[PDB]
Amino acid sequence: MEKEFEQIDKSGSWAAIYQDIRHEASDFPCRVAKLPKNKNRNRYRDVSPFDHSRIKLHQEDNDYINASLIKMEEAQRSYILTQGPLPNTCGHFWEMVWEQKSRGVVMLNRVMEKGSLKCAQYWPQKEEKEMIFEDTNLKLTLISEDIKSYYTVRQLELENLTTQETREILHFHYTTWPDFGVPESPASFLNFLFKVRESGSLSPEHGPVVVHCSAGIGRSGTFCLADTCLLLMDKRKDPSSVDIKKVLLEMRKFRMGLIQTADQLRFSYLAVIEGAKFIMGDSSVQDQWKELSHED
Numbered sequence: 001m002e003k004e005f006e007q008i009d010k011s012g013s014w015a016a017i018y019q020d021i022r023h024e025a026s027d028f029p030c031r032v033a034k035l036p037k038n039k040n041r042n043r044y045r046d047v048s049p050f051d052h053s054r055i056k057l058h059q060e061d062n063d064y065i066n067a068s069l070i071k072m073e074e075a076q077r078s079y080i081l082t083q084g085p086l087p088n089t090c091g092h093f094w095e096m097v098w099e100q101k102s103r104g105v106v107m108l109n110r111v112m113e114k115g116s117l118k119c120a121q122y123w124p125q126k127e128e129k130e131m132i133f134e135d136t137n138l139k140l141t142l143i144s145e146d147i148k149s150y151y152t153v154r155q156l157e158l159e160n161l162t163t164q165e166t167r168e169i170l171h172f173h174y175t176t177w178p179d180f181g182v183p184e185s186p187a188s189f190l191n192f193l194f195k196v197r198e199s200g201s202l203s204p205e206h207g208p209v210v211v212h213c214s215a216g217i218g219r220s221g222t223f224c225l226a227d228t229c230l231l232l233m234d235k236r237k238d239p240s241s242v243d244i245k246k247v248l249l250e251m252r253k254f255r256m257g258l259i260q261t262a263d264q265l266r267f268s269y270l271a272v273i274e275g276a277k278f279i280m281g282d283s284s285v286q287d288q289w290k291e292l293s294h295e296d
């Protein structure tokens with residue numbers, strides 16, 4: 001994996017490798033996302049879920065949400081990638097979380113980034129100010145949160161106001177990953193990834209984790225590609241058989257544009273190569289990433 005990396009970095013050809021991927025990427029219809037009535041449900045007109053893998057809300061008036069189910073068969077993990085909720089789609093977002101039985105939500109963006117609005121404030125910031133999404137009959141409450149230097153983990157309680165059933169949802173919020181950018185370091189990224197892994201929110205006993213940034217393709221694509229490559233390296237006989245480009249194209253069969261820049265692709269290589277040390281038996285790298293990430 002690093003031989004390939006070193007030959008690419010050596011030749012300074014990441015832009016060409018990345019562009020080959022875009023050109024070879026699947027192209028499936030997004031007819032439902034394009035219906036006139038769903039316009040105010042899409043943050044960006046050039047970012048849509050394919051009809052074949054879009055997530056359907058259980059309601060009847062309209063079952064559309066700009067979200068895609070990315071199902072990696074060999075890696076044995078599913079992810080729902082979605083855009084940052086819009087003011088009018090926060091209830092839809094939590095309805096999806098509820099109907100798909102997700103246990104965790106991974107947010108890789110901030111509400112405002114460099115003077116631009118990227119996502120609505122869909123979770124409560126204060127314990128005493130819970131949120132009610134009337135349209136979907138859901139109640140959302142901030143139970144507590146653990147604020148680190150580059151990310152925050154929140155414990156939320158989501159309640160179906162109809163049956164009174166409640167469930168705890170974990171919010172993993174990476175607050176320092178720049179749009180069209182990369183994380184500060186492989187160690188800071190992997191520390192975050194493994195926190196999500198250790199929480200149990202990715203366990204198959206739950207619905208797919210819900211991952212989003214602003215459009216649900218760039219930063220979200222990177223997070224998922226890395227997690228999937230590491231899952232594959234841990235399951236196969238030979239972990240050197242993992243081809244990140246092939247994995248990215250496979251993921252791209254489910255949602256368009258995963259990985260928005262050549263440098264995000266390169267970072268993915270680096271994150272996977274570093275994380276491989278934990279797979280190959282190094283029972284100490286995990287603590288090291290924690291230390292190096294300087295989360296306190």
Ligand SMILES: O=C1C[C@@H](c2ccc(C[C@H](Nc3nc4ccccc4s3)c3nc4ccccc4[nH]3)cc2)S(=O)(=O)N1
Pocket residue numbers: 043044045046047109178179180181213214215216217218219220260
């Ligand atoms: O790393 C990343 C890139 C982000 C991102 C944000 C927005 C868009 C869609 C946006 N479309 C749109 N942006 C706007 C803004 C105002 C009014 C209407 C529209 S459509 C977009 N398409 C672009 C094409 C070339 C270069 C930059 C672009 N940004 C894609 C990816 S992310 O949240 O998926 N993580």
Ligand SMILES: [Mg+2]
Pocket residue numbers: 126127
């Ligand atoms: Mg307070």
